[PDB]
Curated annotation (Swiss-Prot):
Keyword Oxidoreductase among record annotations: yes
Keywords: Dioxygenase, DNA damage, DNA repair, Iron, Metal-binding, Oxidoreductase
Gene this chain is encoded by: alkB
General function of this protein: Dioxygenase that repairs alkylated DNA and RNA containing 3-methylcytosine or 1-methyladenine by oxidative demethylation. Has highest activity towards 3-methylcytosine. Has lower activity towards alkylated DNA containing ethenoadenine, and no detectable activity towards 1-methylguanine or 3-methylthymine. Accepts double-stranded and single-stranded substrates. Requires molecular oxygen, alpha-ketoglutarate and iron. Provides extensive resistance to alkylating agents such as MMS and DMS (SN2 agents), but not to MMNG and MNU (SN1 agents).
Protein name per UniProt: Alpha-ketoglutarate-dependent dioxygenase AlkB
Classification lineage: Bacteria, Pseudomonadati, Pseudomonadota, Gammaproteobacteria, Enterobacterales
Length: 199
């Protein structure tokens, strides 16, 4: 893809149904909820987290917390399937020492999007981002360091894993409004798992 970035198409295919079963298990303790941005806007993407640290929104800005702001209980632990798939994808991408402590689980309903942003809430930029696509296909935008920087448009389908780090660690990215459709394992949505070293 780019410098320090690669797309491992259909990498998570074999682990997919186990990952989805574990998403439901995580969601049973920490439900999927549409977070409100520090500006006051409800996001179209429904989110939840697992592992030690979880990505959330607050009035001060975006941050990581070991506590779920909705349940007021800690986020569920990182499932074995998640940890194993992430490790294998990381090593295959050229980052063998990747040790995630956070997994952001994103649910995209038809028409849901995630506008162009940078993953800049993590202090250690040496650690990559491992992103797993499950279910309905979506067009992933991948740009550069600036907002006006040219965007590459890639389709991400069920089982595709994108890993970006190194030079591409702070590159702008996002998902375009999800096209309506169906998938045998996720029914009417697209699930995405983003593994990060947050601490
Ligand atoms: O859904 C995707 O493929 C990207 C998710 C993402 O960019 C994020 O969670 O920060
Ligand atoms: Co992101």
């Amino acid at each position: 893809l780019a410098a320090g970035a690669v797309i491992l198409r259909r990498f998570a295919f074999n682990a997919a149904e186990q990952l989805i079963r574990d998403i439901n298990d995580v969601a049973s303790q920490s439900p999927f909820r549409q977070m409100v941005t520090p500006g006051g806007y409800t996001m179209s993407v429904a989110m939840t987290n697992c592992g030690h640290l979880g990505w959330t929104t607050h009035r001060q800005g975006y941050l990581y917390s070991p506590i779920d702001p909705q349940t007021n209980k800690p986020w569920p632990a990182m499932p074995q399937s998640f940890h194993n798939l992430c490790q294998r994808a990381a090593t295959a991408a050229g980052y063998p020492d990747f040790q995630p402590d956070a997994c952001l689980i994103n649910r995209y309903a038809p028409g849901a999007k995630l506008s162009l942003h940078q993953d800049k809430d993590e202090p250690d930029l040496r650690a990559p981002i491992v992103s797993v696509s499950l279910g309905l296909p979506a067009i992933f935008q991948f740009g550069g360091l600036k907002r006006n920087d040219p965007l590459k448009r890639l389709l991400l389908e069920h089982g595709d894993v994108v890993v970006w780090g190194g030079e591409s660690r702070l590159f702008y990215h996002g998902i375009q409004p999800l096209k309506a459709g169906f998938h045998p394992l996720t029914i009417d949505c697209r699930y995405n798992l983003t593994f990060r070293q947050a601490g």
